A paper describes a structure:
However, in contrast with what was observed for the HODH251A–MQO complex, following O2-pressurization (40 bar O2 for 2 minutes) Fourier difference maps revealed a strong elongated peak at the R-site of one of the two HODS101A chains in the asymmetric unit. Modelling of this peak as an O2 molecule did not result in negative difference density, and occupancy refinement converged to unity with atomic displacement parameters for both oxygen atoms consistent with those of the surrounding atoms (average B-value MQO = 21.3 Å2, B-value O2(O1) = 20.5 Å2 and B-value O2(O2) = 19.7 Å2). Moreover, omit maps for the individual oxygen atoms produced difference Fourier peaks, supporting the assignment as O2. The equivalent peak in the other protein chain was less prominent and more spherical in shape. We have modelled this peak also as O2 and occupancy refinement converged at 0.80 with an average B-value of 30.3 Å2. Using the fully occupied O2 molecule as a reference, we find that dioxygen binds underneath the A-ring of MQO approximately parallel to its plane at an average distance of 3.2 Å. The ligand's atoms closest to O2(O2) and O2(O1) are C2 at 3.1 Å and C4 at 3.4 Å, respectively, and dioxygen further interacts with the main chain amide groups of W36 and H102 as well as with the side chain of the latter residue. The O2 molecular axis is roughly parallel to the MQO(C2–C4) direction as quantified by the dihedral angle Φ(C4–C2–O2–O1) of −2.2°. Thus, in the HODS101A–MQO–O2 ternary complex, dioxygen appears to preferentially adopt an orientation that mimics that of the endoperoxide during the catalytic cycle (step 4 in Fig. 1B).
Arthrobacter nitroguajacolicus Rü61a 1-H-3-hydroxy-4-oxoquinaldine 2,4-dioxygenase (HOD) and Pseudomonas putida 33/1 1-H-3-hydroxy-4-oxoquinoline 2,4-dioxygenase (QDO) were the first dioxygenases discovered to belong to the ABH-fold family. They catalyze the O2-dependent breakdown of N-heteroaromatic quinolone-type substrates with concomitant carbon monoxide production. Atypical for oxygenases, these enzymes promote the activation of the triplet ground-state O2 molecule without the aid of metal centers or external organic co-factors. Kinetic measurements indicate that their reaction mechanism relies on a fast initial step, during which the substrates' 3-hydroxyl group is deprotonated by the His-Asp subset of the triad, thus promoting its activation for molecular oxygen attack (step 1), whilst the nucleophile is not essential.
Author numbering:
A (entry chain BBB), B (entry chain AAA): 3 to 275
The structure:
Amino acid sequence: DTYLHETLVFDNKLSYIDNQRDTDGPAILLLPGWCHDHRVYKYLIQELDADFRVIVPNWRGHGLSPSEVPDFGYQEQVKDALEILDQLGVETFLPVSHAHGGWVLVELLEQAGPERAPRGIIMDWLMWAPKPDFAKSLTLLKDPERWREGTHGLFDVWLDGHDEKRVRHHLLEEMADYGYDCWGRSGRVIEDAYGRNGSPMQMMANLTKTRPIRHIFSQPTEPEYEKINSDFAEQHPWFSYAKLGGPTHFPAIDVPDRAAVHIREFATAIRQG
Amino acid sequence: DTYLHETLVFDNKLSYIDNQRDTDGPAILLLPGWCHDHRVYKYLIQELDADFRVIVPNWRGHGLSPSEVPDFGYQEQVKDALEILDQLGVETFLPVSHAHGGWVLVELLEQAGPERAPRGIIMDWLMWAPKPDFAKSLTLLKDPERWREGTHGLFDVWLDGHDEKRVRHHLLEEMADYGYDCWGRSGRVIEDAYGRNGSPMQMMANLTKTRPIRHIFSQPTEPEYEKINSDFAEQHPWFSYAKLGGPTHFPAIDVPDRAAVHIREFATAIRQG
Ligand SMILES: Cc1cc(=O)c2ccccc2[nH]1
Ligand SMILES: Cc1cc(=O)c2ccccc2[nH]1
Ligand code: NA
């Protein structure tokens, strides 16, 4: 929280982490998903603080004081992220997303191009089109009468029967101040993203300039899900994955050391040409 | 449609009008706005055909067969337009834009400089930051559930209670094949353009090399809008305007003779040193 800043981004005052580390590029851009903020990355920032410049933008209506804002999508998140990087004078960066931060990361690869964003790490991001249970969850979040029932079902899936203190603290304390305006929006945007782009996999395959992307995930834990990642990886030389074997949907929190080594590896690859 | 061509522009096959008129410069570059094409200029091309070389580039995913393309902005439109001018071996040109074609025209003045692009004509282009009605329209266009409602509200404003046959034909027939991918994009880019640059007026004032620019418009029709143009013109010797008193947002269609004389005047000024 030493590193927490505010700046005007077009019409919106956005909070963002920036450790202002004077070191060789690329900068690490940690991308929150929906209805949480930089706090998800507090442990991963500890892993990276000393060796890298670390930037964590918070979305419109996101941060330590969540607020009602006009409707926006992953395109707006991309412009917001770049506008912060333009203000900070950051050129080359390695974007790292959690879950539906991924929609922002892939579009940011498309819009920034392969000189500015040569690689991407996507963390715990449902690679297939929505299964019935997840589809239902999106429907609940959009429902003004059942949005909290939506979050409760998703919390259950994300903790996956683990009494994981740090991740429980994130869901129940650090995301407590987020209301229907955010959760409803997340349901609409993610449902729309899947409907329009088909899947994260279809979207990455569809990039104008394919680049090295790694998916590091703990869940879903079933072999069928490992197989779709293995099947995509076999088909696409630029695509790789690592199953982190962490307890929850939030490897940034519950295996921050493991998330860090994959990021350092990609950051190192970028420095080596 | 004698003059309709196709060419590879970086990664995209773009259609463009070129009458290949062998005459003295400058070439007249008619710039379409968002989610229409060269058809908007069919009557203005008739006015200019005999006396000038006339070039009308169509944007990525724009033309007689609209298509889904990766997200691009006014910067990409500028590079596309220049790449076509480079391929055609056109040196000096007079750019003429309709509505949010203007973002392309002003950036094209910046990038081409005052030797290559000594003047610009901007047609019916909202000079002020978005008013509530237009802001709402941008919000609707971006909405995948209400984008068509967005276009319908804009059609209403643009026809302004006129049974204008040619302009009705343009909106309802010649723009009929344009879907959410374009209209959604137009909303995001125009909202971004205003948010980034403030207004067309702020953007023109901010040019590295200020040059003669005329705004010719029919709407908005209210004296307050004439005043902001009069106020900008008083402040900037290079800036002028003419109220065309055409029924609609499309003076290229409903007063093509009037658009033509202002273009000829500027083209003549350029030939006279
Ligand atoms: C923080 C976070 C993680 C998720 O997987 C998610 C999924 C749907 C909606 C909102 C979401 N928010
Ligand atoms: C043809 C055309 C004129 C406009 O004033 C406009 C405004 C917003 C979006 C798209 C647009 N398209
Ligand atoms: Na591979």
